[model samples]
Target chain A: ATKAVCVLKGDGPVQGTIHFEAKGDTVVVTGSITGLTEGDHGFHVHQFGDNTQGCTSAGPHFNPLSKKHGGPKDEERHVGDLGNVTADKNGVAIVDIVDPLISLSGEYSIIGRTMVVHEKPDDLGRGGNEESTKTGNAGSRLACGVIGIAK
Target chain B: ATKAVCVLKGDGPVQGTIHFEAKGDTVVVTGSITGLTEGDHGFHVHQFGDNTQGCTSAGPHFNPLSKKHGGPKDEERHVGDLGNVTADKNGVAIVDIVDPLISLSGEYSIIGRTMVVHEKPDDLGRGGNEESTKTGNAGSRLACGVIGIAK
Candidate 1:
């Protein structure tokens, strides 16, 4: 198995580190993110790891299979959709999740892609709005980091 | 001050980490890079951190100042012109550099830029070729990582 990591940052005070470990057919996600409001924030793997224009240029959520927006457990969800990560009153989110969709190698690898933290919660395509099917209506991008191979 | 880090990886087995620490006017760069041939390899910060297309799409060397390509200590060089990092017979390069040109904040900050390792040696604009004046004759990009803000 292999490991990956991303050092998150943005134009604001948002900063953190995210870790990804491949275990068989699943990738275990864990990290500690800071400088966020108290509550849930949209978290997704973006198509491009590009940061030439900061978080705005990362494109949209990674959807290699051309699927719609949905929760992490949804059968018809985007591969990048890992759902939301919630923060505490002190503005820190301790994440621990196991995802079976994304891969670290092969055709569905997420290496070199961007992991983004949105300004609002990911509605999980149930917002009853047109944009929900596309973006989950997550607000502006707050911070992002490129996924890179690690030891 | 602030700090930043990049997790390095490429199509090959190249893997490592590069760290940046801001100290007033200068930034201290230190890290370990592996999976390289014995000898020197061109190293420089790139214009973009975008990896949607891997290292090939990182564009040219970061030249926010629009200066010509030169060595790290040259008087008129690109802000990203970091020269090279030498690797040992074991394919390891231990980097320790103090650069006075870059910053972690302000106008010259390299926060969202990409740091790239080239396949060939950088002539530092003394190769007398036209490409030397532009890219220092550095060959294909071997590995890269985005300079992300760190704790």
Candidate 2:
């Protein structure tokens, strides 16, 4: 398994991590998150690993397919549109997801990229709004992390 | 919202910060992480924030729920079962999660808790083993951070 890790980033205490491991042709994501508002928050793999400009500067989601914003189970969407992470009543949200658009090796690899957790839900192109279709309308990035290869 | 944060400590490039911000009843967590080997790594909020003993001193997951080591979505999981963070080929991962099991202003608050990044995936009580039911069998500590009130 070609596995990788992403550590969180941002200026707020909205912290957590997402694990990405290549299984077959998809990437499996698992999260251990704390300090949420007990709801679904937008989550996705961002375009750049350079956080020199804060979350607003991580660029957009990795869209190698040139697709629109989409759901985790959609047919046509950005390669990085992995969707939301839901929190429970105890302010903790653990997330597990699988994505087929990314790879750990080759051009579609997620190396040196950025991951962003937004303040809202990713409508998955179903919100009927422009931002949702373009970027899922996930809202401001609460936290961010960079993807790195496993030792 | 008043923002609080934690800085993770570990060997070499494996470092990060988790930010906490208040939003109504829950605190939002944001993070910027770097220097991790690519792949899945275990993550959790431990009982103690003191890293004097590295991550081991953090005790177990902040499981005030007195539950088992289930997935984050499980009704009987630990209050601190925020799972894993994945990195890409370049060693970066950013994580954001909203948790209700933790707090910032009460007895169950995580302000003094320690955040640990392990070397393995927490099996989420599905490993069919005793340790998995207790701590998901996530392995060794790679990095640690203490939740601190952001000034």
Candidate 3:
């Protein structure tokens, strides 16, 4: 099985770790995050691991098929869209997600890209707002980290 | 050649990219960084890629042999001690270095660890200060990123 990891940080107090493991046709995601408000936060695999200008340099979400932004369960969503991760009042988020769209090796592998956390909850493209289809209205990028091959 | 890359970012305005290519027993390092003061900055490979608390979680320099801190040219130095990179008045540092100590794979592989840039110049453990032996008194961590396998 292939494995990967990332350490997420940003200009603010946000700090976190994300782990990815390839399980057959799906990918298992797990980790914890701190320094966030009590609510849902947008999380996704970004196009590039390049953070030369901070999270802004990570570019947009990995939308290889050029699909609209949607939830993990939605087939029309971008490959990077895994929806939101909820945070507790103590500013802690426990992540445990499994998705079939993400790969660790091969042509669509996300090994060299980035994982980003947004300031606001992702509507999963369901909101009627103009930014929904583009970014799920997920507001500012709070933190990001590169996904790398793990030992 | 085995290639790896990292995109470094942190709390301040610092941002950059570092590339590594393994040639024989040595590794070639090259990159460009911006948003630094006009001076030399300490650069090194850290022990871990875990930045759960920002750059602080990346841990100490990659000293697998438990050696003392020293310059990149010193045989007594830590394997991670790649010395410093100078920044110009415009806050840009162009990196081009080749060292025999660092490796991308095998027993001393640096993959999945981290690359860190410091706030102050490293004395390379040559200084008599108390902190010189441990950290070269390089001060705070300015930026860090995970070393990932590149295509």
Candidate 4:
């Protein structure tokens, strides 16, 4: 089994953490973050893992399969568009799900990539907007984390 | 890197996680939270991993160093005191930072502690008040998560 931890990069009170575990034919990403307002936040994997300019430098979402931004169970969705992490009344949000397209190795290895936390909700490319199909209208990048190998 | 913190004020409906990475001496403490009001919320590392008394049972900050409630940068701050996190219009909050205080190893390690989110923003001990130096005057505990071990 292969697993990785992506440490969020941004300037806030504290940073967040994401874990990617390759189990069977999918990648299980479990993330927990803070400093959020308490609702829904867009979470996705980016193309580049470079944090030179923080999340902005990480480039766009990891669309290796050249698909649209949809939910985890969608027919047509980007490999990076996993889904959303919703916060609660106490302002804490967490998500644990498996993605078929994302892997720790092979044709869709998520290594050397970046995970981005978007400011708005990702419509899963179903918002009927132009950018929704490509970006899911997930708005500005709030945080960035590098996906690297782990034990 | 897995986030596991029970919401101190609610049922199990609302949950959250805390992500972190160790960078040499200091570690970047990234956080994720939900179920919060749209505003500034305080985040901290409370002493004791015990969840018996809820947030109150978490005890004071894990101040084995016995510092004050300044900020993540202050040399004289609590072992906790991660500062504040902000939630967006969607009521979601996320924070990312490279703090010089927190650690995952050694004496300053936050292992077995409780991560708490407050109802208000941390004053960073600059509020010119008495509690500001100790509690940051961040108000009552809103949510909490325990700091456990990882592989």
Candidate 5:
């Protein structure tokens, strides 16, 4: 099995470690998260491969086909869209998910892209705002990371 | 030229994305973080593979050898220690760093782990408080995700 590594860099001490295993058309990702607040935060992959300018430098979500932003289970969601992460009072979170849009053999792998977290919970458009159409009502950019091959 | 993918999952909205490339012993992770306030936040890798118990489920830092709980730059630090991330008023954080302790071939790979964001910055022991031992006054866990193979 091929291996890879991911590093998150941001204002807050955002830290994470992940593992990926491939099985046909599905990719299984598993890992734990720490150093956050006790609440909900938005999580997703964005387009670009640069952190020189910080989160904004990464540009918009990974909408290669320019699809509208939606939830991970959305039918017409942006390629970058994953979903929200809920942190407990202890300020920690754990995650595991499978995605078909990404792959180690395809050009659309999440590598060379950025992952971001928000300060607030994503309303998923219930907040009644235009930005929600593109971002799911998630507020404030808090942390970020870049995906890459493991050393 | 293998590929990889990263996904962020949490209660709040994650706004930014970054990309990285691994070459030999060095892994260059670069990405922008958004949806945050202007300041520093604590970041690190937890020692677990499940979020079912929330942040607590992620366990303590990935200190395989039980090293001191210090920043990534520290010589005698935990394997999970990756240091703090800085942000700007625009609510975005850009990250770039290299570490020898973390590698794809080693026990500390991106897969089977989690990434997290904090609402507050880590004190880093400068505060001289009781919480200085476990995490050096690093604040809550905001968001989280499991690292997985791209395909």
Candidate 6:
């Protein structure tokens, strides 16, 4: 099985560590997070390697399959779409996801994809807002990290 | 009204300009997160100013009200429990949230709280056999930043 580790970096004191393990047709991701306020912030996977321009520099969602931007549960979803992660009173957050498009043994997975943290929660698909076209209701760009094969 | 700004730094690269503004009972957090994988990650606000031990040193959530850790929609919830953020394939995560506990008129707000990102998604409960506590599933610590009063 192929595995990858990711780390978040930023000025807001946000921290996270994740491990991606490929299991058959899915990539099982698990990890923890801490140092944030109490509420729902938007979370998702992105494309690119430029953080110098902040989140904007990253560019857009990874659509290798050219799928529309939608939640992970959506029928037509982007390759980078994974949905949201909630944080608690202890300033900690954890995650576990199974993605079919991503894996350790495949060359079409998110091994080279990037991850990002937003400052707001996604509305899913509430309004017809432009920003809502890709990610529903989520807000500001906060932190980010790159996904790569773990050693 | 008081305001705070959170920045991104660490293992990954991030630049450009991100800021947070607060007014009375409203908080407008704006920023761009970059350099990440294409998927969902955890994000939240925390208590304390001790980043000497790195971002993880920020400790638990900033819940002066001492409520249970739950989603933002939950009535009985912690003051520091903010939800998740999604990133685009471009590796950019944006965010924004409003809460009563986070006020711009008093010191009880999130002007000085810390922000963090996690490698995984929060289970929203204690971890045991998958259906754990709502606070977090306890994964890896990624990156972090501090919320500071806007000058």
lDDT of 1: 0.82
* Candidate 1 deviant stretches above 4 angstroms: B1-144, B147-151
Query: Using lDDT as the measure, what is the rank order of every candidate, best first?
Result: 3, 1, 2, 4, 5, 6
| lDDT, residue B14, candidate 2 | 82
Candidate 5, residue B96: how far the Cα is off, in Å: 20
Q: Pick the candidate with the highest lDDT.
A: 3
Q: lDDT by residue for model 3 over A1-151, one digit each (tens)?
A: 1887887888999989899989989999999889999999999988776665778877888888888999999999999998999999999999999999988766567766789999999999989987998889889999988786564
lDDT of candidate 3 at residue A59, scale 0 to 100: 80
Indicate the worst ten consecutive residues by lDDT in candidate 3 chain A: A104-113
The global C-alpha lDDT for each of the candidates, from Candidate 1 onward, is 0.82, 0.72, 0.85, 0.69, 0.62, 0.60
Candidate 2 local lDDT, A1-151, one digit each (tens): 1766666656776777667788999888886777777898898877655444566656878887788888878898888888889989987789898888888666666654667888887889998879878878778888875564432
Interface RMSD of each: 10.2, 11.4, 3.5, 13.1, 10.0, 12.8
Give the DockQ (C-alpha) for candidate 2. 0.03
lDDT of 2 by residue, B17-67 (tens): 777777888867778677877887777887654343456656788877788
lDDT of 6 by residue, A60-132 (tens): 7666677666777777777777777788987677877787665543445554345777777766644478777
* Positional deviation of residue B3's Cα in model 2 after best superposition, in angstroms: 33
Chain A vs. true chain A, TM-score per model, equals 0.97, 0.95, 0.98, 0.93, 0.87, 0.87
Write the residue-wise lDDT of candidate 4 on B1-151 in tens digits. Answer: 2221122233433345566667665677665677777888778888654443456656777677777787877888887878888888777887776667667655665543567888889989899988898889998887764454332
Give the poorly placed runs of model 6, Cα more than 4 Å off: A105-107, B1-151
Give each model's clash number.
Answer: 1, 69, 0, 48, 78, 105
> Which numbered prediction scores highest in TM-score against the true structure?
3
Task: Point out where model 4 deviates above 4 Å.
Answer: B1-151
Instruction: Give the i-RMS of model 5 in Å.
Output: 10.0
Error of 1 at B137 (Å): 19
User: What are the per-residue Cα lDDT tens digits for candidate 5 across B1-151?
Assistant: 2223234445565444433345677555556667777898776667653455444456676677776777776777777776777888887778776766654334455544555556788765456676764676777676554433331
**Candidate 6 local lDDT, residue A53:** 53
